[PDB]
Symmetry: D2
Subunit: 210 residues, 4 copies
């Protein structure tokens, strides 16, 4: 950082982290023969780049802190319209189409707070063309301290796979003994620092940042 | 078969012949030079504005790019939708560096002009630009009452121009000034992504965010 | 191709779907397991022996690979030219780890068998392998006086096999054991480079040197 | 540390280095009359570590003292390069300069010996025509020799290719163009230098 011309070398250029990368095709192939099942998807930075709404929320309710995340007024705006500014991730499209082909039941489990009304389910169904037969209303698990709110829902809906970008998404899957697969969080996300994908030895989907 | 394409060390270390530069190297290259005029493209250069453009398309032209011609879209985009635009860190670093030098900052955009705009305000607030170095956003185009980006670069005598698109760089070369490329983010809705360095120009590292 | 091809952030971040592992991860996966038999291919796995093959080609077959079938080449290659072979650091780490475990180490090669060989001594000296864990190099082949690689893997009951070639990995698969891939250096003369991970196998990171 | 993981900012992170290709170098010389250019030898045009490795194992297993043993240089300069592997990056550069009609010079820091077959090895491996070939130049700090810098000025070289920092500073001191070649990761000459540490041009994929 304090070096004007750091230069580089071939050992560093070729250096690789010991991560288990997988592709959508590889995941689909690993599911050959398996009958329809319940699968879950994280929302923020997994299927939607929702930073635009979280950014406006921060500037609007807590310019110098994260208190906006605990403000009921922020969640009202976020879950009822701000996802109109959320950009769908290509990696998610491919996964959702793949699961739709298998006839799998799709669930969305988010750490967002639950509000009286929400249009998130609709935005997800419309943007990813999810048939009514595979779609399920979004589950707002919320976020409590010293506890992982995702676990209860993964267990009750008997989800066999869970896609997520955060550590708590992956550890939740591990707690339930199911297959947790990591999605890369975009570099321009406002939710930092970026998590260390593969920090639990889990499978990480290549090029899933967009 | 092609389920596992694998890879090899030659592919892992392969590099494209690009002239990469850092903000600190740019600064160092300007040491001793007096304050000057510098310009910045806006979209995908200093602001990740795809959210607004994405909503604009889904709202006015779901199956095409016609929304880019709809005056109703531009009224919304230049008057508030940038509150949903994410400022780029690379830009922040560049702007702070130019402010320290006392340079005069200009913003040139190909966005359509509207009677009113709050983009200038959003830019000055998000990047904490002093009024001394701030200048109202300039909207360029092919229209009769408006000058092209080239004409604006010459008129203000900009010595450096930052941008993510090929037209941003060629304009700079056509004026004989220094054109520096900014990387466009992979999740931008404006695709395909351009080839940074395709003109042998300098490209700022890790400038995608 | 083109003079100034440039690049984009999607391409810069693109990753192949490969299962990378580190030596530390391999050791951890062996925790608690009693001493066992493991095997290593030789060329481009534990030794960068291209210098000997390069000189062989230049001396006996400048225009082809006919030297690989010349008895005169193998006499020199297995009795001294490996003094010019450079040990790989990835291999040292793997061998040191298996030595700490007390495992028996076997070296399997597809090199033509000669009446005498100094390769075994070269390997033992270079990787400081204790007498109890060292075993004479095994020359595998088609000849009626020798067994294939698969046969040796089974006969010695090797649980793991390290190699840089596709046939090294398929050999491990056929025997139902754990085949682990080592990257072949880009300056090796044995080309083209194989596609590490083409069989979904584990590939050791930074194992090109 | 067992599972360090990674993130996309780290995967796309680039060092601020000025990379160039042989084609871009050729293009920048468009229209220039034939000139003199120079190449370092070890890890620049030849992967000579095999011989240095054997030398080390034979005279200084635990150190680099072999680099000052006369017995080592006699063998290194008269035959061990038969095990030295030509670099493809250098092959392209040399062909490119030969096509332009430029004069090729090879400057090395290896200790000078009575006889040497290195010149022969280079001319044959890279098929350099007599009209462009010149005997290897052994530069040094001894009173009977000239420094690399003096040789660059003497022969009026306009470009110097090398993998080491001193190769680049030598060119800088002469006011000529110094271009960096990447040293192979399996070279025995460690640690690897930081290519670009002088803001100089660095040739892509030049490790092999
Ligand atoms: Mg998330
Ligand atoms: Mg732009
Ligand atoms: Mg091999
Ligand atoms: Mg050198
Ligand atoms: Na989550």
């Amino acid at each position: 950082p304090s070096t004007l011309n750091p230069g580089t070398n071939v050992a560093k250029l070729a250096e690789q982290a010991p991560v288990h990368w997988v592709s959508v095709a590889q995941i689909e192939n690993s599911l050959t023969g398996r009958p329809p099942m319940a699968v879950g998807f994280d929302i923020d930075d997994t299927v939607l780049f929702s930073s635009p709404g979280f950014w406006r929320g921060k500037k609007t309710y807590s310019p110098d802190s994260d208190d906006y995340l605990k403000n009921p007024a922020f969640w009202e705006k976020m879950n009822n319209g701000w996802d109109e500014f959320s950009i769908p991730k290509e990696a998610a499209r491919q996964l959702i189409d793949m699961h739709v082909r298998r006839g799998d039941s799709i669930y969305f489990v988010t750490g967002r707070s639950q509000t009286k009304t929400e249009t998130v389910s609709k935005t997800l169904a419309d943007n990813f063309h999810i048939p009514a037969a595979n779609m399920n209303p979004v589950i707002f698990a919320g976020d409590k301290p010293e506890q992982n709110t995702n676990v209860q829902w993964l267990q009750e809906k008997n989800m066999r796979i869970f896609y997520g970008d955060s550590d708590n998404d992956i550890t939740a899957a591990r707690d339930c003994g199911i297959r947790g697969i990591r999605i890369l969080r975009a570099a321009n996300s406002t939710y930092k620092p970026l998590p260390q994908a593969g920090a639990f030895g889990e499978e990480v989907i290549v090029n899933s940042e967009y």
